[PDB]
Amino acid sequence: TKFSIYPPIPGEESSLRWAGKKFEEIPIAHIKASHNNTQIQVVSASNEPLAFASCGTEGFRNAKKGTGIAAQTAGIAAAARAKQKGVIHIRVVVKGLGPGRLSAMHGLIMGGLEVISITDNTPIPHXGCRPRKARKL
Amino acid sequence: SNEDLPISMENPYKEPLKKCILCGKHVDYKNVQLLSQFVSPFTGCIYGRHITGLCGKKQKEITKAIKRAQIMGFMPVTYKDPAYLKDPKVCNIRYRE
Amino acid sequence: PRYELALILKAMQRPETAATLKRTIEALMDRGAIVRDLENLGERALPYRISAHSQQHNRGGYFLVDFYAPTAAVESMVEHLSRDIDVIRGNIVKHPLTQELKECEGIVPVPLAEKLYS
Amino acid sequence: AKHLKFIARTVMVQEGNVESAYRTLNRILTMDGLIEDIKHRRYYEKPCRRRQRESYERCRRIYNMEMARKINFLMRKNRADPWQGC
Amino acid sequence: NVESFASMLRHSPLTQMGPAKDKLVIGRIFHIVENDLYIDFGGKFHCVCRRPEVDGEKYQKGTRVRLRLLDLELTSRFLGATTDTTVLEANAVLLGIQES
Amino acid sequence: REVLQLQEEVKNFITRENLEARVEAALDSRKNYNWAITREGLVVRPQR
Ligand code: FES
């Protein structure tokens, strides 16, 4: 069968499986890529937390937290604590356009996890709160 | 005077005006299958007329129909309903790989 | 005028759904409406989660009621539906079949000069 | 928040190629205008400024589309010289 | 009994053809530049067609060919112009060679 | 002509007497407003 980039829809009968688990059962790696920090949490399909790592918890401080290599290190740390709990395949949900948006996913792979999907959940208000005024630089 | 002189009349070879795919059809907010053909599969964003090929009148009806259907409980806002992903692709937009 | 009531009902068994429709159609008649037809669009998953009357809903029964009523009945009916606990979401619109579609010859081109001038 | 998850803005990875999956997602969000929308939303753009930029963006597209049409039309004669020496 | 111009024009093949779009016409190659064939088909302007890949050597000066016409004169008016820009050539698609 | 057409339709209009029968007659049926359009302007009715 040809490859579909569209995820399997829950309730339909798909043939795709990962270690005998359906798409709806794969744990989720939630990456919050901010401009000055990156936070990574791996949770189960039932919303059970399994591992958490951020650049701040990995000994990065101030502007060093807002780097790709800092997020990559946080991903490796979250992968290690998650792999101990039985995680191999993860669904990645990244919100934000920070520097650790892509690098945080690299660290998850180097840590022994297999990414089966990528989801963006960057909050976009449909009209929402007034942002801060423009900067004069 | 002269029989061979040109005669005044309307262009007999004139071709009909172009029509959008929905010209002459009623656009109902309950017809979510039709409306879903004009929104992004991944983001639910309504396509501009340069992608849908619709005229101003039908582009407006589709937009108003989508907005009505969304908030009345007939259509999702943030994504195209997956049931309608295999419908005819009438939009000039290429996405995947 | 002629109106169309788009009615989403709480997912219930056949007996309670019929009682809700009867109770809803009788409310229309009590306000002077002449009910023309009742159409079942089927039970389906909602496009998103809807909270109504201290409950969360993921499925609903979609119904249509075509009816004529005085202009003052719409305001009273909208208020009636807001208090019925078995109604998830109800909207009253002017019936689409009343609006007659005007004929279109086609797509007349727009002069480019007007675009930048405008 | 009330919609189903893992449908919107979701791309599946093929053969472990996460870089190509990320590029496809970034292309999707770019084409739909989400990336530019997120960026413009970091600081409040004032209505007089938003209208001015939208007017500039719409007029630049027309001029670029019209200048492309002219170049395409006037490139038909780019063939070799048929009357060389005259 | 001298024929008038109005009479010549009414009964001319070019007048009788009507619109030129999607009309099959017979052309004659009069000038060739590498793989560019210059073909006159009875109109004001010639058309320029690239030598077909198959039987390219059969197309020589004087060879009569079949064309599908698109426009007798390629012209367009561009923004900010008072007149039309013309490239002084017709638009036609070369189908093949005419044989008896 | 519009009054005649309207006079026949009123025979099928819902009433307090026939309300229960029409309510049940609707729960058994299904009305589908869904259809799709093609690049050629042709309607593609649903597979039901
Ligand atoms: S072209 Fe006629 S309604 Fe769109």
Side-chain angles (χ1 to χ4, degrees), chain C residues 58-108:
Chain C
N58 295 109
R59 300 186 64 80
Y62 285 70
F63 292 93
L64 292 177
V65 188
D66 181 7
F67 68 99
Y68 305 84
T71 54
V74 178
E75 182 171 8
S76 177
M77 190 64 193
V78 169
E79 205 286 332
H80 175 82
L81 296 169
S82 300
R83 298 188 272 91
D84 194 328
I85 57 168
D86 296 326
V87 174
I88 294 171
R89 187 164 290 183
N91 291 282
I92 298 170
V93 299
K94 300 199 295 292
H95 204 278
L97 299 183
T98 49
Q99 300 148 349
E100 300 176 356
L101 303 182
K102 189 175 178 186
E103 296 166 52
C104 177
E105 278 180 18
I107 302 159
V108 66

Side-chain angles (χ1 to χ4, degrees), chain B residues 28 30-34 84, chain C residues 39-42 44 62 64, chain F residues 29-36 44-48:
Chain B
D28 197 330
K30 289 166 282 145
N31 180 8
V32 179
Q33 182 167 17
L34 175 67
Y84 307 128
Chain C
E39 290 179 334
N40 187 5
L41 307 181
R44 63 183 77 164
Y62 285 70
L64 292 177
Chain F
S29 189
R30 294 293 185 285
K31 172 61 184 160
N32 200 338
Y33 285 96
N34 289 3
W35 56 264
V44 177
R45 302 299 311 194
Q47 294 301 321
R48 301 194 181 178

Side-chain angles (χ1 to χ4, degrees), chain D residues 41-54:
Chain D
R41 284 180 179 271
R42 185 177 179 182
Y43 311 98
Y44 182 74
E45 187 167 39
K46 285 163 166 261
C48 74
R49 309 282 291 171
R50 185 164 170 85
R51 289 191 304 270
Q52 285 168 35
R53 177 184 58 79
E54 288 176 353

Side-chain angles (χ1 to χ4, degrees), chain B residues 40-45 47 75-80 82 93-97, chain D residues 3-5 7-12 14 20-21 24 27-29 31-32 34:
Chain B
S40 179
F42 306 97
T43 55
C45 284
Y47 287 138
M75 189 176 177
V77 188
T78 56
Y79 54 77
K80 187 166 167 166
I93 185 143
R94 171 67 64 81
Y95 276 132
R96 65 185 302 160
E97 300 281 338
Chain D
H3 283 88
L4 294 178
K5 291 180 173 172
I7 306 173
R9 317 182 200 165
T10 301
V11 166
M12 302 296 285
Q14 186 175 18
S20 76
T24 300
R27 184 166 54 257
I28 289 160
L29 302 175
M31 294 171 80
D32 288 0
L34 273 64

Side-chain angles (χ1 to χ4, degrees), chain C residues 112 115-116, chain D residues 55-73, chain E residues 78-79:
Chain C
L112 198 83
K115 292 187 200 181
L116 282 157
Chain D
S55 178
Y56 184 76
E57 286 180 351
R58 173 188 166 281
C59 296
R60 174 168 55 84
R61 195 178 325 94
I62 295 160
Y63 165 87
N64 284 335
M65 283 188 304
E66 185 56 45
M67 186 61 58
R69 206 177 66 86
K70 183 168 178 188
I71 292 159
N72 294 347
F73 184 88
Chain E
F78 299 111
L79 179 64

